[PDB]
């Protein structure tokens, strides 16, 4: 009585469909629903008895055609897109969902398909690919930029799998350590380079990095070639699936090497000043004290400081490179040689002495000569002062020797005191040379002997 | 052995399809292609012998259900959209394409429908509109990771667009020069700090940067505040579409003038401390004329020697 409803499905549905017969020769379209003929534009008889192949053309990819024909003989289904041309020739994209109808025996008997004009994704490919290409070329620009800032500037780059301990070391990182460009790295291999003082800090931090919290370490290493390097390292664990700790490691040696030296400059200055400020600790200790002549004790102070400030300018012909005894023996004893012209004699080699001794020199020179004018040989008319110094030896060393000899003076009696010089000599002149100092009050003249081992804080 | 190619053509198509049986109570469903059990996620035994009504729900415009019930009654086709609900509960538009099946006399025997989801269709225009921006975010992610490394490693970085002359200056680069955190830098702002005796060298190899030939240069700048600084600039040229000149700069005013630093400091830490302590002790020159000044003229001097030893502690 009544028809088959499944034909009314394929007949009325707006989905273009097709049936073909692979027992008829060359698999011809036996059925074409009206939608397939609204899609293609051809007429009912024009698409019957022919093979679908007729929709292809010059732009139709002859590679897709192989893929379909392959599966048809395989008797397996196939989904694929291909170019087709409307009856008016207007090409479109045709998506084919092609399936093989088997019967009860298991032998093929029909092919069925569903066709769709998926020429909307054509503009979707042109949009998506044109953009996501120029955007992955935008990235390729900011790759080479980052890559270059790491060639230069030497930026190390390491990772540690927080769960397993797997490590990755970038080339600059391997360059910063003493590492072969391709040997395996673990926490192991790095810590074996950290100086023993700084190990427990590294361990405590590498076992701390569960917090996902950016830490920052400084630690020194000793490369496999004996070189020593300071390192800053900033890390920050990225929690997630495989928790990686990501770290930056850069070499900060030239900064550290130059920091801990620029402080050494102002370190000695803070030592050459609690010695020079406390140098006048003695110059004012004795001079303007409880004297019978506070008016003349500043006639003397301004004369013993006019000589200490002479012990500062000798270090200007040479950049504090000490001075020569040949120049200092002229520095402090040229004012005397005005009145006592050619009555003080200097004998010795052209030598060299550290600048923290050239100060205690031009004072002991100026002080002892002042003693010669008061009590000693530079007081009378025909007194003379003999200064001899020469490098010689006794107990195997190459030690230093000098003599203050006062000849043709007045007979030297004995001192009833032991004033400022007699300890300016034993205490801040012997402790300026590692010296063994001596004084004899011979009746003939003042005999002063000095003996100093060579330790280039005294003899450069 | 004689299977139907039509019974198999709907069997396999991806268009949801229904065939109902009006000559039965309630006009129930007696066929649903698997393309229907996907669209509604229901099992097989869950849509057979039950009216297509059961897909409707609480948000279904009833004036729609009226014209559908009306066309069914009058044996007409209908092409309408209606809000239906999946087995999950998803609120999705449903495009009903319904047709009558009139037998060989003109007598309503069957009803057929091809269902079309206009929620999976009308969303793919915004399912990859959210993909065009995932790939616009990976791009901005990589220009960021650059910016991120330049910060954490505190690196003085600069980029001169070779054609245009536009420049970008990293933070540390702007701190090395005497530069505002965000002032517009070009080549002038960097040259106006160069000392006269080094401008030619800066210029000579700033035009010699065209040929992708990496170059290093040292030169002095007098900062805006008066500080003099030595800088080593290592630069290059990436030749892509528009060539970017890549360059790094670091303050070396130390590895340079440290011979003079250590020297010309003692040349003034004694130049003005011999000069500076040779007169503060001329104050003991202005306290001595009476007696017992080693009792008060030292209470008027020892308060100046740790007034300078504490001015540096
Ligand atoms: C049911 C069915 C429908 C097909 N529909 C089309 C079609 O619409 N457009 C098309 O180019 N090819 C279609 N084909 C593929 C062609 O029929 C043919 O197989 C293709 O051109 C490759 O095979 P051939 O090299 O022997 O021609 C269809 C195939 C089958 C089995
Ligand atoms: C072939 C066919 C398919 C139908 N498919 C749906 C459907 O998918 N969703 C829906 O809400 N209604 C569908 N209907 C409509 C409902 O079954 C029915 O018309 C609705 O309940 C309104 O009639 P009523 O007031 O008697 O319930 C379909 C009707 C037919 C004849
Ligand atoms: N060149 C010399 N020749 C002989 N005797 C000397 C001498 N220099 C010092 N004396 C003797 O040693 C004593 C103390 O020597 P010293 O020079 O250290 O103190 P002083 O009396 O000169 C006070 P001040 O040293 O502060 O000027 C003198 O009084 C003197 O007897
Ligand atoms: Cl670490
Ligand atoms: Cl049936
Ligand atoms: Cl430049
Ligand atoms: Mg004396």
The number of E-state strands of chain A comes to 15
Question: For this structure, what is the CATH homologous superfamily of the largest domain in chain A?
Answer: Histidine kinase-like ATPase, C-terminal domain
Q: What is the general shape of chain A?
A: rod-shaped
Helix content of chain A: 25-40%
The order of strands across the largest sheet of chain A is 2-1-5-4-3
Total tally of structural domains of chain A:
3
Distance between the termini of chain A: 129 Å
CATH architecture call of the largest domain in chain A: 2-Layer Sandwich
CATH topology of the largest domain in chain A: Heat Shock Protein 90
The assembly state of the depicted protein chains is homodimer
Biggest chain-to-chain interface with counts: A-B, 80 and 87 residues
Q: Structural class of the helices, strands and pairings of chain A? A: alpha+beta
Strand content of chain A: 15-25%
Number of helices of chain A: 14
**H/E element sequence of chain A:** HEEHHEEEHEEHHHEEEHHHHHEHEEHEE
Assign the CATH class of the largest domain in chain A.
Alpha Beta
Instruction: Describe the largest sheet of chain A.
Output: 5 strands, antiparallel
| Rounded radius of gyration of chain A (Å) | 52 Å
Bound molecules: flavin mononucleotide, phosphomethylphosphonic acid adenylate ester, chloride ion, magnesium ion
């Amino acid at each position: 009585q009544a028809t088959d409803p499944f034909r009314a499905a394929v007949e009325f549905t707006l989905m273009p469909m097709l049936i073909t017969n692979p027992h008829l020769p060359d698999n011809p379209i036996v059925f074409a629903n009206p939608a397939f003929l609204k899609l293609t534009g051809y007429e009912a008889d024009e698409v019957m008895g022919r093979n679908c192949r007729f929709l292809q053309g010059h732009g139709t990819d002859p590679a897709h055609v192989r893929a379909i024909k392959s599966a048809i003989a395989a008797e397996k289904p196939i989904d694929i897109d291909i170019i087709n041309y409307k009856k008016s020739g207007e090409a479109f994209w045709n998506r084919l969902h092609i399936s093989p109808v088997h019967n009860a025996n298991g032998r093929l008997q029909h092919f069925v398909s569903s066709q769709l004009d998926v020429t909307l994704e054509l503009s979707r490919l042109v949009e998506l690919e044109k953009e996501r290409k120029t955007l992955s070329i935008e990235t390729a620009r900011s790759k080479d930029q980052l890559d270059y800032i790491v060639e230069v500037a030497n930026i190390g780059f390491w990772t540690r799998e927080f769960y397993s301990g797997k490590m990755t070391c970038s080339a600059e990182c391997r360059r910063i350590y003493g590492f072969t460009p391709d040997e395996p790295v673990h926490f192991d291999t790095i810590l074996d380079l950290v100086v023993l003082e700084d190990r427990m800090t590294v361990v405590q931090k590498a076992h701390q990095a569960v917090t996902g919290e950016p830490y920052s370490i400084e630690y020194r290493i000793v490369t496999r070639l004996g070189e020593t390097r300071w390192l800053e390292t900033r890390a920050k664990a990225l929690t997630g699936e495989n928790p990686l700790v990501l770290g930056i490691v850069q070499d900060v040696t030239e900064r550290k090497k130059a920091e801990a030296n620029k402080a050494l400059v102002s370190r000695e200055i803070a030592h050459r000043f609690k010695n020079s400020m406390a140098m006048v600790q003695s110059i004012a200790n004795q001079t303007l004290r409880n004297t019978y002549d506070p008016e003349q004790a500043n006639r003397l102070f301004s004369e013993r400081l006019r000589a200490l400030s002479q012990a500062h300018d000798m270090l200007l012909k040479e950049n504090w490179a000490g001075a020569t005894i040949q120049q200092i023996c002229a520095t402090a004893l040229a004012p005397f040689n005005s009145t006592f012209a050619n009555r003080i004699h200097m004998s010795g080699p052209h030598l060299l002495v550290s600048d923290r001794v050239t100060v205690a020199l031009s004072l002991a020179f100026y002080e002892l000569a002042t003693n010669a004018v008061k009590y000693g040989a530079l007081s009378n008319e025909k007194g003379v002062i003999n200064i001899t110094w020469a490098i010689m030896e006794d107990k195997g060393e190459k030690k230093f020797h000098m003599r203050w000899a006062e000849s043709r003076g007045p007979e030297v009696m004995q001192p009833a005191r032991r004033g400022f010089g007699q300890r300016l000599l034993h205490s801040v002149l012997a402790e300026e040379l590692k010296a063994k100092c001596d004084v004899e009050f011979a009746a003939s003249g003042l005999l002063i002997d000095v003996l100093a081992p060579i330790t280039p804080e005294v003899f450069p």
